[model samples]
Target: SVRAIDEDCSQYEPIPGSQKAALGYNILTQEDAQSVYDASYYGGQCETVYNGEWRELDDEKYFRKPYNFLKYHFEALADTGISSEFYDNANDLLSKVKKDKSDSFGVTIGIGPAGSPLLVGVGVSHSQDTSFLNELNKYNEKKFIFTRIFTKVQTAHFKMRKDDIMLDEGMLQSLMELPDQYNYGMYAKFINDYGTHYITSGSMGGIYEYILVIDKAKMESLXXXXXXXXXXXXRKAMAVEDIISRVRGGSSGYRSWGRSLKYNPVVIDFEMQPIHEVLRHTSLGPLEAKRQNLRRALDQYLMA
Candidate 1:
């Protein structure tokens, strides 16, 4: 079996025009990020799509339909941005991975990993609007939270307006010069009626209340990154995503209505810090920890 301490993974090298992404800085272009998103989201192999007509996965699958089957190779799922980049040229990667063995291309980032349920949400006319807050007040705020997902292009766009935004009254570590929790969380700001804003597991972090409309300039740039960013996020967010999930008990009829389901299913990821863009590939061997350690080492040594 291959070990992380010594897995021949030269094939996962960075793309020719690409560089390792640093935390505070992203090296992905809109095109590159989109490419990453495309691969990370769908198309496991070289099979012709269900039809000759290519379609976006909005209505059916997450991306393209009729993912081809390759008995010789396991269907690969990009699962993360880097892998998305690595697998965008799928056939090429597959060919190299199985240069010696075709039984399995070693381990893969492929799997129909479960996703969170659409908690169901809505948009508000403006901040402090009682309707949205009133609806939220009926339930546990901790069970629900507001989030604005941003893609590479959108994040880069946000960075351009960061100076003007950090001053917007939320998502800051300090406001009125008070100590802020920006250190504990990413950017640390999201949508909500007033100051009751927080994070939660049920939400894909895509809810925006009336308050967000005021920051329309920033909100406008929001985009989803559930596909590729997961590479960098790995399983850490899964805890956040699955937090309180087991203890989460929902049933009966909802006394309220909502929107943003699609947004939540495909939410955004905004890493507004000096965190590097590192993704953990399947570079581990058995005993599990060894693989995890190898994954980290590989990411650090190669991607970071």
Candidate 2:
């Protein structure tokens, strides 16, 4: 029940600050806007790095004209080593994308250069493009969460299910096979269809949205905690700590869950105050000295 479309910017003139601005938010600095412009300029041109080498994009096969960031940016930006979070989110979006559904009619609206909104692309079931223009006209005064949030964030990251990977060539190729104008032209279309459904479901929908918002912020806080006050899980990364019992025996190692364990008998589980080693695992100090200090503190607690 989903489709995407690319937008043309010819009519939507870029205005200096036409979008809503709250205090110091929404608007980007002169330099930040320029950075976005520069990235899109080159990105739209099909200039990308692949296999550890810069690709000049001489091959006609690689070109996507009238380049929309929504359609082509993810593929072009593949090797930038952009943060894992970004990749996870992008991959998640791609996984859900499919050819336009036959029965539904829809179009996508994207932010214009100056923060205004315009119909960038459309999708209709019977054939391809005709009635969507009527659908397009109705959006003149309407506001979408997609357009609203983009104005504030300036740059947007799509959300991913946990452990999702970055956009791969196969996924991008599949998207390309779909109608160019109906696959991806705006960030909202990538996730909005489901979003509209989420909102229609009522209060529960809004709760999850805020949950996602706070989870990112709180996850950052947990990192600073080291940084934790938890259950421990083993992995190669610093962010791996969690309730080990819940995480183990989940997902196959090669795919879904990377740290899945076959058997995790408790090393020593009983009701006691907490273990010194657990505190020492999270604390910052000379390793042995930290352990000794924790042990001394616990031993004194018993006596007292």
Candidate 3:
């Protein structure tokens, strides 16, 4: 009983009960995040493997044509700007790790139409030389949270613009503005409408430049001054970030949804952070502390 992947689980849609049994391990697993489309669009590898064993079919009986198999890898790694950048960054880190034979390494990636209006993310990879594998875990260390946040922002923007076309170059510029007396209230209203914008995660410190569409007023309020920027110390903002981290809820629903699809899965990471920062400045203490706060907050959120 072969069936398509349930990409959308809208309430109004009829359930495909007959095909339920065909989909094994249907709950959100680590594998599912890494291969959201691979299972269905790429010929259902798990089903193929299982059917071959259960039905006593030859290995080649269910194997995808070589071209199709290769094509799926490309599709999985480079289908979107976000996906492409993540894959590229992962490969870069893997190469460095491979060369250095190091136990851990860090990498950063920026995803957007032009690197501005960006959703930058950082991940630390950890693998011993003896156990080193040539694969990147995009979801390692809860990095998928960053993926989830950026994607939700994009999808929400797509709907807000009321344009059927998606993924425009003008993502952050249209909505984000520096807080001047004229636009201060505008930023406040935007923040009110879209509450709990999780800024960053780990100790990227100097990393994170171009971020999503939070008004500059909130930015100024959160950071105070670029010269002496620090993580929000007040309970309200910290608590809100904590709440947003929990709201992501492992960053994936048990089934396929917009929440699950537009994300990168982690592999073997030691750390992760959302790439959202203002201008680069000295005194790494504040930035480093902010990043640690974010990492700890996400850790608590995940302690899921």
- Highest lDDT scorer: 3
Task: Please give, for residues 1-304, the per-residue lDDT of candidate 2 as tens digits.
Answer: 0112343323222111111100010011101010101112222223221111213212222222222122211111101101112212321311222122110111122222233222111211222222322332232223211100010011111111112212223323322333423222231222221111100000000000000111233346552322121112113443332211111112343213221211111000001112232222322333344334434443444343
**True lDDT of residue 32, candidate 1:** 11
Report the lDDT tens digits of candidate 1 across residue range 1-304.
Answer: 1123343333232111111111121221111111111111112222211211113111121222111111111121221112122222222332343343221112111111243221112211233224334543443322323222111111110111211111112212122232222221212211111121111111112221111001223224541232333333333422132211000111223101112122112222222211111111212123233223323332343342
How many clashing pairs does model 1 include? Answer: 11
Best by TM-score: 3
- Model 3 Cα lDDT, one tens digit per residue, 65-95: 2111121110111111121111223334335
Off by over 4 Å in 2: 1-111, 115-304
lDDT of 1 at 172: 20
- Model 3's lDDT to the true fold? 0.22
Model 3 scores worst on lDDT over the 10 consecutive residues at 154-163
lDDT of each: 0.20, 0.19, 0.22
Ranking by lDDT: 3, 1, 2
Judging by lDDT, tell me the better candidate of 1 and 3.
3
TM match of model 3 to true structure: 0.18
Candidate 2 lDDT (Cα, 0 to 1): 0.19
